[PDB]
């Protein structure tokens, strides 16, 4: 049994079919159509306003399309959050992913969104990261110190933070 989890999120890979996603996530946790179009949206445990969740996008609406998009909130926990507002201030538009991670801490971030519009090429890859300070992350409630870092082709395009100290 089991709800959608961080582990299941990790196991699902770009290139996978719709049936693979369902097999790994657990079909009873997932839905498609409606608000989600041809994507597959799978629910984790109840959390704050909604639930922890993942959303998997596909190359087309075809039954045989492949995963080109992975998104989640509150499934993945940062492994060592060391972000602070000061470090957030040092982050600048135009930095590479490598330089951003060196500034905010190599374990402060989780992947909120990762999309390949030209799958399987990485051309135009958009990456969105959620980053946290010491006790900022919450998988069942409301963040208490977080930032949103957005990249395109591995280069920082934007940053935003809430409640960081």
């Amino acid at each position: 049994a089991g709800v959608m989890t961080g582990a299941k999120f990790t196991q699902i890979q770009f290139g996978m079919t719709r049936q693979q996603v369902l097999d790994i996530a657990g079909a009873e946790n997932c839905e498609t159509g409606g608000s989600f179009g041809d994507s597959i949206h799978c629910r984790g445990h109840a959390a704050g306003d909604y639930y922890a969740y993942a959303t998997f996008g596909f190359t087309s609406a075809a039954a045989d399309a492949k995963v080109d998009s992975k998104s989640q909130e509150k499934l993945l926990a940062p492994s060592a959050p060391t972000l602070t507002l000061a470090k957030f201030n040092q982050v600048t538009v135009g930095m590479t992913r490598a330089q951003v991670l060196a500034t905010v801490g190599q374990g402060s971030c989780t992947t909120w969104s990762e999309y390949y519009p030209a799958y399987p090429s990485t051309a135009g890859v958009t990456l969105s990261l959620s980053c946290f300070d010491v006790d900022g992350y919450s998988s069942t409630g409301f963040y208490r110190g977080s930032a949103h870092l957005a990249f395109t082709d591995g280069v920082l395009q934007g940053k935003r933070q809430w409640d960081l100290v």
Partner: protein, 263 residues
Amino acid sequence: HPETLVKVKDAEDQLGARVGYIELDLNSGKILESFRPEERFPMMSTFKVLLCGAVLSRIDAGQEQLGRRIHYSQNDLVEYSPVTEKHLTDGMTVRELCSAAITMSDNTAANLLLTTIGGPKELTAFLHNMGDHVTRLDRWEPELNEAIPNDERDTTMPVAMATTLRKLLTGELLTLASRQQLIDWMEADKVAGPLLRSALPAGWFIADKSGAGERGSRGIIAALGPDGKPSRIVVIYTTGSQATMDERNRQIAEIGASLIKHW
């Protein structure tokens, strides 16, 4: 049939915090029973129904189009945005935004809708002009959920909210088309299953909207009734408790169980 009100008491004993509650007849507007009907409690996501009532009012008056498409960016995305994060590339129409705000409690959709009407000040102005001089929205998502003790920002009173919701759903404030759309959005709520819906007997109608915040805040507004027809409005809020999420859900569900058994 008086025993919902004792359960409320219990709920304060188990939760160890304030609980506000009112039950109002949908058709007459008469109050049937209440407990702390006039203390302030954080609205949390409960405000999103009021937001969309403001948007439908603008639609009714030719100020807005439900089919209008809104384009936004990554910079707009906030905590708890399952639908808006999915449509980042294509955008979303006003109608899709209210759907996501009300059925899915999408925080980014609520912010986008707030900006269409002029922000929190203008929602409060809308509420003021329809006779609600208590309810007030001051902040955007996600700050509005903080529930700071004694902070009156982003609060309402059970009695004020019940009356406002009745006016939106039964008055001539909105057209019959807009009332059907607003009620149907609430009826399709996908995120309040552990609350009143969990005590609802087969055949009963319910249209609702729940909320959750910091400091143990949790609440719900609803129009419900037997025979698949709504006949009463129910508003319940609580804030300040230390109990778990599931403990807070249980108490609200049990109050609902009691008002249903004593209908």
